[PDB]
Subunit: 25 residues, 4 copies
């Protein structure tokens, strides 16, 4: 389990990419 939460935390990137997209607009 503490494992599955670690793999979920593997979301920061999603954020980063959203920011990048905004920059692209």
């Amino acid at each position: 389990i503490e494992d599955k939460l670690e793999e979920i935390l593997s979301x920061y990137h999603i954020e980063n990419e959203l920011a990048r997209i905004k920059k692209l607009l």
Copy 2:
């Protein structure tokens, strides 16, 4: 652990930014 879920909840922002992107289109 209750900790790792707190850091995952640190997603609301992802939503917000998506909405912002839509506004940019």
Copy 3:
């Protein structure tokens, strides 16, 4: 806790909005 996972599941929407964005492009 089972609670914090319920609030995390409150991501489907993120998907939906991404799809919508694509449609906007």
Copy 4:
């Protein structure tokens, strides 16, 4: 519960779609 984390892991796609969006810009 290990179940709710499995359904949360059902985020990889979110990533993929973001990448696709970038490609669309």
